[PDB]
Design a protein around this ligand. Structure first.
Ligand SMILES: *Cc1c(COP(=O)(O)O)cnc(C)c1O
Ligand SMILES: *Cc1c(COP(=O)(O)O)cnc(C)c1O
Lengths: 354, 354
């Protein structure tokens, strides 16, 4: 007798699906756990052509994004969020059971999830104490590695990776592996993007998204920026129609010049609010340390983090626990929402302090 | 010196991407090449929550579909079209380089495309002369096979697969492989669905879509119907957020009771129009034979098919060439559109006849 489960691939039977969920519908009122823009930006459909298939790579979207990012349109690929971008890279360059990817914890969990689901070895090299790259460590473990992911600014720690070190990492991987800079949060520190580096690195790829600064996580729309050769290789493994018409429709609107202007005003907003929360947190008794941030979230180390986490959780204030992340013992990640929401966190944290 | 291309997986470098495209914007006026409903059905967004991530499996969608299909909600999975459903199945049960899938040409090209892109052997067993299953042939080639795809009604031939043979196929794969019935066109012959067979076959999976009868190809929304055990296994390999909010929003509307009522009226419409075109075609001189259809498209064998195809193509009448499909030499697939469109085809075909 054979069960359906016995027919499933070994790795599929043993893996643990990504822990993104942690809901409590109608239970909590303050959501600061997913790094989402705190307020809804409305968009209405303009293309009533739903009976016809869309273009594999909607032209308006690709062009509007290329324009915004300062790259050529043939250097842009649009997918169902950065999540799909992460997948495509592995799908195109990593031979299952032979090649490996490499990332440096503590960082985003999707790199690992995709490789493990697909069947590609996950090589890890923890970042240093300040979360910068352990360059020497990476140099000793590139054998068999085809793709290297590096998040900058990094989630959940918040800091930018030393560009000087990216230079080094790019040199170590030249002719050996693709380096993928996850710039999910680059909108908050646009001047640190590596997008202008494409002309000197044929193996550099960049992940972008509309789920954060752009306040359109609901659209599940993201992009990959890379040289022609890389984009075309990725186009060979992508689904024929990855983007729905309604998403292409509104994404193109969100990327219009006026759209870009509003996105930037949302950024200035979050940055000013972030600096407020950062200043206040450091003064709260139960707060041991607040780490610098170039994003829309703050990592802080608390006294009895689990107790604090649970207390605020029961009060409708949902944060993201980082307690099990390597080196982040006692840390919680706080998303930057509105002034009201930041005040809720502050007032709740002040109620602890034992 | 190593090129980026040298870093790509071997199979990725050698594969040929699916041939779905064949556009000529503003050149042709009659589109009958993609099996799309001929007329746009409008839908407007109702959920302005785009700044927040959606549910991995939108509850309204899953439930409305389960209700429509007559199955339990825990037996339903929603994805970015049947295309993603096809992928998920392979991703969960086929070990790259070890297991294989099996399909029977001439049929849908995505099964092969996904397996080849992922790295899974494609086993083939052509259907008999009348396109029914070569049961004996399949029985001799199941070793190493984990997933079997069978399209019914079949694309591009149009006929339903003998249910009696599905019984046989399901018995041959019991405890060895998952049988996937692609019911992309079952809406046009709903009584032939295998959806009610779930209770007796733990390895049966069914592909469904909103791109055809439902006239919402633009939404890139599809489903997989299977027993709990199978759905849960597929849920372990699916992307965290496969459906965008706008798609979940409108798909749920399209699946409301009133939505179902309209879908069925679209079906009756296409069926009546199909029978018209079928009757007329058979009388046209350049038409050698018209094959029976239980879908929204007709396969017909022509005299000098390539010449006919090109002639109509230059007149703005776009059909789908099947000339390179195994056993379909001289056949073109005609999608059923409006009465006007059918008349255009008829009048154009009558202009040939040499
Ligand atoms: C949120 C986030 C993303 C975005 O993914 P999408 O699929 O585009 O929603 C990517 N990377 C990191 C590190 C993130 O935190
Ligand atoms: C059109 C079609 C589909 C539908 O795919 P979607 O991704 O849901 O648009 C599936 N199977 C066959 C055989 C088809 O012809």
């Amino acid at each position: 007798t054979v069960t359906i489960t016995d027919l499933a691939r070994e790795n599929v039977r043993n893996l643990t699906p990504y822990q993104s969920a942690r809901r409590l519908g109608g239970n909590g009122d303050v959501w600061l756990n997913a790094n989402e823009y705190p307020t809804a930006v409305e968009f209405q459909l303009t293309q009533q052509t739903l009976n016809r298939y869309p273009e594999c790579q909607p032209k308006a979207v690709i062009e509007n994004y290329a324009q915004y990012a300062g790259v050529k349109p043939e250097q842009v690929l649009v997918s169902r969020g950065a999540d799909e971008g992460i997948e495509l890279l592995i799908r195109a360059f990593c031979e299952p059971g032979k090649d490996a990817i490499l990332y440096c914890p503590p960082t985003y969990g999707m790199y690992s999830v995709s490789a493990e689901t697909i069947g590609v070895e996950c090589r890890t090299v923890p970042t240093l104490d300040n979360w910068q790259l352990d360059l020497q460590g990476i140099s000793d473990k590139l054998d068999g590695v085809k793709v290297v992911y590096v998040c900058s600014p990094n989630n959940p720690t918040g800091q930018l990776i030393n560009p000087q070190d990216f230079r080094t990492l790019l040199e170590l991987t030249r002719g050996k592996a693709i380096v993928v800079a996850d710039e999910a949060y680059i909108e908050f520190c646009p001047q640190a993007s590596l997008a202008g580096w494409l002309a000197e690195y044929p193996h550099l790829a960049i992940l972008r998204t509309l789920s954060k600064a752009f306040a359109l996580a609901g659209l599940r729309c993201g992009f990959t920026l890379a040289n022609e050769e890389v984009i075309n290789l990725l186009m060979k493994v992508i689904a024929p129609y990855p983007l729905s018409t309604p998403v292409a429709d509104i994404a193109a609107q969100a990327l219009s010049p006026q759209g870009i202007v509003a996105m930037r005003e949302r950024v200035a907003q979050i940055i000013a609010e972030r600096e407020y929360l950062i200043a206040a947190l450091k003064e709260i008794p139960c707060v041991e340390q607040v780490f610098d941030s170039e994003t829309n979230y703050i990592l802080a180390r608390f006294k009895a983090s689990s107790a604090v986490f649970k207390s605020l959780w029961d009060q409708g204030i949902i944060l993201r626990d980082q307690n099990k992340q390597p080196s982040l013992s006692g840390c919680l990640r706080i998303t930057v929402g509105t002034r009201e929401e930041s005040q809720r966190v502050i007032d709740a944290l002040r109620a602890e302090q034992v």
